[PDB]
Design a protein that fits this description.
Elements: H1 4-33, H2 38-50, H3 52-63, H4 67-92, H5 99-118, H6 125-146, H7 152-185, H8 195-201, H9 204-215, H10 219-244, H11 251-270, H12 275-291
Helix pairs in contact: 1-2, 1-7, 1-9, 2-6, 2-10, 3-4, 3-10, 4-8, 4-9, 4-10, 4-11, 4-12, 5-6, 5-11, 6-10, 9-10
The protein binds pentadecane (6 copies), calcium ion and sodium ion (NA) (2 copies).
One pentadecane binds next to helix 5 and helix 6.
PDB class: membrane protein
Keywords: Na+/Ca2+ exchange, Calcium signalling, membrane protein
Assembly: monomeric
């Protein structure tokens, strides 16, 4: 069952490549239809849609008595979204953040700090409930501040979005599924092959989507996708995971995330998110994946 593993692998890449573009284009059209900014549509629809793997992963893992994976996958994705995903995107298409999206990012920072503080002694199911409620509040707050027949322009837009989303979710799965089949067929299969492959596999939707939007100079959409995903990973994935079982404290990873989130805000507020800010993000992500524990 090799080659068919290469089959799922390459095909998943193709579905990720074109699927992300369709998702970006469809989301961009939807945003203009509902008269909202690209940030808003990225922080809500796109973010939640791409964070669906994390939510299902964290829920399933915690239910299977593996709470370490649940919180590990959740936080690792957050670090990945700022370090790798935003890092690459910022370099491709530098972002100048308007004074109104700066407020949203500051709110994001507060949310992260709050999660880190209450997570010091781990995350209880009550911690999850609270985070999930704030998650819900953030969404409505974001949409309001960015708001205000079978129309063929609207239908085609929704088809682009949905099919594109299916493309990146199925594609990301085929990528991981093809990679597990190859490693097994080549007898090079550990168990953090493995945990590394799936945790990064859940981040593949955000990566390809944000890179697609970055290529089209949609920096607001990219920034929304990153900020929204992180909140969806904490208020959604991590929260749901804590409902099934107490999640052990990841104080080091949370600290890294808080620092990265702090850096993201300061750059957006007093400077820009461009090449050298993107380079710094990639540097920290590389240092993170080099010295953080598996
Ligand atoms: C799964 C996708 C859920 C998307 C919810 C979008 C709410 C958008 C409000 C504007
Ligand atoms: C939604 C925004 C939440 C900001 C943190 C609230 C708890 C402190
Ligand atoms: C937990 C105590 C309340 C939240 C403190 C940190 C707010 C950010
Ligand atoms: C919409 C559902 C939100 C989450 C509700 C979670 C309830 C979790 C209960 C976990 C066990 C609590 C045992 C207490 C002794
Ligand atoms: C970005 C800075 C990352 C620092 C990681 C320190 C890891 C220490 C072992 C856990
Ligand atoms: C244990 C290994 C710790 C490695 C730390 C590397 C530097 C981390 C901070 C980098 C700031 C730029
Ligand atoms: Ca706690
Ligand atoms: Na994801
Ligand atoms: Na996401």
């Amino acid at each position: 069952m090799v080659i068919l593993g290469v089959g799922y692998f390459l095909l998943g890449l193709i579905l990720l490549y074109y699927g992300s573009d369709w998702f970006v284009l469809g989301s961009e059209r939807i945003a203009r239809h509902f008269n909202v900014s690209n940030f808003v549509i990225g922080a809500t629809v796109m973010a939640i849609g791409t964070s669906l793997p994390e939510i299902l992963t964290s829920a399933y893992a915690s239910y299977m008595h593996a709470p370490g994976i649940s919180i590990g996958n959740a936080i690792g994705s957050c670090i990945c979204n700022i370090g790798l995903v935003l890092g690459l995107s910022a370099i491709i298409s530098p972002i100048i953040v308007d004074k109104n999206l700066q407020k949203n990012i500051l709110v994001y920072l507060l949310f992260v700090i709050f999660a880190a503080v209450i997570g010091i002694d781990g995350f209880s199911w009550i911690d999850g409930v609270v985070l999930l409620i704030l998650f819900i509040i953030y969404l409505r707050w974001t949409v309001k501040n960015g708001s205000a027949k079978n129309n063929p322009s609207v239908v085609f837009s929704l088809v682009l979005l949905i099919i594109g989303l299916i493309g990146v979710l199925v594609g990301a799965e085929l990528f991981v599924d093809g990679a597990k089949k190859i490693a097994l067929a080549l007898d090079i299969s550990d168990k953090v092959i493995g945990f590394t492959l799936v945790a990064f596999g859940t981040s593949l939707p955000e990566l390809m989507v944000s890179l697609a939007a970055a290529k089209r100079n949609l920096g607001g959409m990219v920034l929304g996708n990153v900020i929204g995903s992180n909140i969806a990973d904490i208020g959604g994935a991590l929260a749901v995971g804590s409902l099934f079982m107490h999640l052990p404290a990841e104080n080091v990873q949370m600290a890294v995330l808080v620092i990265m989130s702090l850096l993201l805000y300061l750059f957006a507020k007093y400077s820009k998110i461009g090449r050298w800010q993107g380079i710094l993000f990639l540097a920290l992500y590389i240092i993170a994946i080099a010295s953080l524990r598996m």
